Design a protein around this motif. Structure first.
Motif, PDB file in Angstrom:
ATOM      1  N   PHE A 156     -23.264 -27.658   8.855  1.00 18.93           N
ATOM      2  CA  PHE A 156     -22.234 -28.539   7.977  1.00 18.93           C
ATOM      3  C   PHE A 156     -23.090 -29.621   7.100  1.00 18.93           C
ATOM      4  O   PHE A 156     -23.618 -30.565   7.767  1.00 18.93           O
ATOM      5  CB  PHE A 156     -21.167 -29.310   8.764  1.00 18.93           C
ATOM      6  CG  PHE A 156     -20.131 -28.726   9.370  1.00 18.93           C
ATOM      7  CD1 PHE A 156     -20.206 -27.806  10.550  1.00 18.93           C
ATOM      8  CD2 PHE A 156     -18.907 -28.540   8.637  1.00 18.93           C
ATOM      9  CE1 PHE A 156     -19.233 -27.003  10.841  1.00 18.93           C
ATOM     10  CE2 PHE A 156     -17.835 -28.053   9.211  1.00 18.93           C
ATOM     11  CZ  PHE A 156     -17.876 -27.336  10.566  1.00 18.93           C
ATOM     12  N   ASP A 157     -23.194 -29.572   5.766  1.00 21.88           N
ATOM     13  CA  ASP A 157     -23.087 -30.770   5.085  1.00 21.88           C
ATOM     14  C   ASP A 157     -22.056 -31.629   5.206  1.00 21.88           C
ATOM     15  O   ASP A 157     -20.983 -31.427   6.022  1.00 21.88           O
ATOM     16  CB  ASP A 157     -23.036 -30.216   3.431  1.00 21.88           C
ATOM     17  CG  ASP A 157     -23.334 -31.435   2.644  1.00 21.88           C
ATOM     18  OD1 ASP A 157     -24.209 -32.466   3.108  1.00 21.88           O
ATOM     19  OD2 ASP A 157     -22.600 -31.437   1.664  1.00 21.88           O
ATOM     20  N   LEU A 158     -22.303 -33.133   5.008  1.00 26.93           N
ATOM     21  CA  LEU A 158     -21.331 -34.027   5.169  1.00 26.93           C
ATOM     22  C   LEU A 158     -20.451 -34.553   3.901  1.00 26.93           C
ATOM     23  O   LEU A 158     -19.150 -34.153   3.682  1.00 26.93           O
ATOM     24  CB  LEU A 158     -21.588 -35.270   5.967  1.00 26.93           C
ATOM     25  CG  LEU A 158     -20.690 -36.164   6.613  1.00 26.93           C
ATOM     26  CD1 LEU A 158     -21.297 -37.072   7.646  1.00 26.93           C
ATOM     27  CD2 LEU A 158     -19.886 -36.890   5.500  1.00 26.93           C
ATOM     28  N   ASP A 159     -21.105 -34.935   3.167  1.00 30.20           N
ATOM     29  CA  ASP A 159     -20.651 -35.683   1.935  1.00 30.20           C
ATOM     30  C   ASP A 159     -19.844 -34.684   0.755  1.00 30.20           C
ATOM     31  O   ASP A 159     -20.805 -33.854   0.494  1.00 30.20           O
ATOM     32  CB  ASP A 159     -21.646 -36.457   1.261  1.00 30.20           C
ATOM     33  CG  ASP A 159     -22.280 -37.510   2.080  1.00 30.20           C
ATOM     34  OD1 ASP A 159     -21.429 -38.231   2.804  1.00 30.20           O
ATOM     35  OD2 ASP A 159     -23.233 -37.792   1.801  1.00 30.20           O
ATOM     36  N   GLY A 160     -18.776 -34.686   0.824  1.00 29.66           N
ATOM     37  CA  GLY A 160     -17.915 -33.691   0.023  1.00 29.66           C
ATOM     38  C   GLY A 160     -17.605 -32.356   0.991  1.00 29.66           C
ATOM     39  O   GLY A 160     -17.071 -31.254   0.023  1.00 29.66           O
ATOM     40  N   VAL A 161     -17.747 -32.322   1.911  1.00 35.69           N
ATOM     41  CA  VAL A 161     -17.492 -30.991   2.896  1.00 35.69           C
ATOM     42  C   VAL A 161     -16.613 -31.404   3.726  1.00 35.69           C
ATOM     43  O   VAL A 161     -15.525 -31.075   4.170  1.00 35.69           O
ATOM     44  CB  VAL A 161     -18.847 -30.179   3.388  1.00 35.69           C
ATOM     45  CG1 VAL A 161     -18.436 -29.315   4.521  1.00 35.69           C
ATOM     46  CG2 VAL A 161     -19.509 -29.842   2.303  1.00 35.69           C
ATOM     47  N   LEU A 164     -22.064 -24.688   5.148  1.00 36.64           N
ATOM     48  CA  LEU A 164     -21.069 -25.128   4.160  1.00 36.64           C
ATOM     49  C   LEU A 164     -21.653 -26.317   3.406  1.00 36.64           C
ATOM     50  O   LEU A 164     -22.024 -27.394   4.107  1.00 36.64           O
ATOM     51  CB  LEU A 164     -19.841 -25.581   5.175  1.00 36.64           C
ATOM     52  CG  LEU A 164     -19.270 -24.412   6.173  1.00 36.64           C
ATOM     53  CD1 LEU A 164     -18.330 -25.120   6.807  1.00 36.64           C
ATOM     54  CD2 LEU A 164     -19.020 -23.239   5.234  1.00 36.64           C
ATOM     55  N   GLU A 165     -21.362 -26.113   2.139  1.00 38.93           N
ATOM     56  CA  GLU A 165     -21.992 -27.024   0.934  1.00 38.93           C
ATOM     57  C   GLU A 165     -20.982 -27.250   0.017  1.00 38.93           C
ATOM     58  O   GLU A 165     -20.244 -26.113  -0.569  1.00 38.93           O
ATOM     59  CB  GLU A 165     -23.334 -26.558   0.842  1.00 38.93           C
ATOM     60  CG  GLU A 165     -24.465 -27.202   1.335  1.00 38.93           C
ATOM     61  CD  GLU A 165     -24.653 -28.792   0.749  1.00 38.93           C
ATOM     62  OE1 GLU A 165     -23.985 -28.943  -0.251  1.00 38.93           O
ATOM     63  OE2 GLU A 165     -25.607 -29.231   1.339  1.00 38.93           O
ATOM     64  N   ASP A 166     -21.183 -28.354  -0.869  1.00 38.37           N
ATOM     65  CA  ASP A 166     -20.476 -28.660  -2.031  1.00 38.37           C
ATOM     66  C   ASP A 166     -21.480 -28.996  -3.260  1.00 38.37           C
ATOM     67  O   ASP A 166     -20.895 -29.244  -4.146  1.00 38.37           O
ATOM     68  CB  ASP A 166     -19.521 -29.938  -1.884  1.00 38.37           C
ATOM     69  CG  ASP A 166     -20.391 -31.070  -1.635  1.00 38.37           C
ATOM     70  OD1 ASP A 166     -21.612 -31.304  -1.106  1.00 38.37           O
ATOM     71  OD2 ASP A 166     -20.037 -32.294  -2.262  1.00 38.37           O
ATOM     72  N   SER A 167     -22.722 -28.677  -2.981  1.00 43.68           N
ATOM     73  CA  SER A 167     -23.429 -29.134  -4.052  1.00 43.68           C
ATOM     74  C   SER A 167     -24.635 -27.948  -4.343  1.00 43.68           C
ATOM     75  O   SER A 167     -24.643 -27.136  -3.656  1.00 43.68           O
ATOM     76  CB  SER A 167     -24.621 -30.124  -3.490  1.00 43.68           C
ATOM     77  OG  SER A 167     -25.485 -29.784  -2.428  1.00 43.68           O
TER      78      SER A 167
END
Ligand SMILES: O=P(O)(O)[C@H](F)[C@@H]1O[C@H](CO)[C@@H](O)[C@H](O)[C@H]1O
Ligand SMILES: [Mg+2]
Length: 215
Positions: A7-12, A165-168
């Motif tokens: 897991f990414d954190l920021d935005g996920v 899992l990523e938002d970037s």
């Protein structure tokens, strides 16, 4: 079957990508740089604190000023997140963590952020994580794959048997180069049309991760 989720954190996990954006924009404008808009900020998502600042500056300061500026933005950001709570966990994420643990799938954090552990505590999520990859320990950060490799190693699973899992943009590239399978969250116009992308984290269900892993 995949054996870990990274897991990414920021935005996920929560909407802290928005606070990073607002904090970097405030900093840039203080120094007369007005180009940090939402589109530019796609270049700062997932990127280390120093690399983020340098991307902004490339739009020269002394080494002393560089250090002060990074600290100033972090101090502001840290103030911004003090009231984060479990209610701020993004939809689907808490249940995903529960379902992963019930199915004996390892859970690791692969965040660039030195503020990651504090945020997981704020959200009452620390106990779900089998490991937190310390971003200060890796020789290279996103888009280098090191942090995802480290997260997988920390829970004893091959990256090739992990989902990230990523938002970037930077983080998707990092997952790709680690060997893990990326599932992005956000707009295809930002994140590309070549991997699986969901529009929001409600789509991050164990059922769907299985659906994707099978396909
Ligand atoms: O929280 P920090 O400053 O230690 C960490 F470097 C931040 O990580 C974010 C991704 O998780 C970046 O988007 C952000 O620019 C960066 O400051
Ligand atoms: Mg992110």
């Amino acid at each position: 079957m995949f054996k870990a989720v990274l897991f990414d954190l920021d935005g996920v996990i929560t909407d802290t990508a928005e606070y990073h954006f607002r904090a970097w924009k405030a900093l840039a404008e203080e120094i007369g740089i007005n180009g940090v808009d939402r589109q530019f900020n796609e270049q700062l998502k997932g990127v280390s604190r120093e690399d983020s600042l340098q991307k902004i500056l490339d739009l020269k300061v002394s080494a002393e000023e560089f250090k002060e500026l990074a600290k100033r933005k972090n101090d502001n950001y840290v103030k911004m997140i003090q009231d984060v709570s479990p209610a701020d966990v993004y939809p689907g994420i808490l249940q995903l963590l529960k379902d992963l643990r019930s199915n004996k799938i390892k859970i690791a954090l692969a965040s660039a952020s030195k503020n990651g552990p504090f945020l997981l505590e704020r959200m009452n999520l620390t106990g779900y994580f089998d490991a937190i990859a310390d971003p200060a320990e890796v020789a290279a950060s996103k888009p280098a794959p090191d942090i995802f490799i480290a997260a997988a190693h920390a829970v004893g699973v091959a990256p090739s048997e992990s989902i990230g899992l990523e938002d970037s943009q930077a983080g998707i590239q990092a997952i790709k180069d680690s060997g893990a399978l990326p599932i992005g969250v956000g707009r295809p116009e930002d994140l590309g049309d070549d991997i699986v992308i969901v529009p929001d984290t409600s789509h991050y269900t164990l059922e769907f991760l299985k659906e994707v892993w099978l396909q």
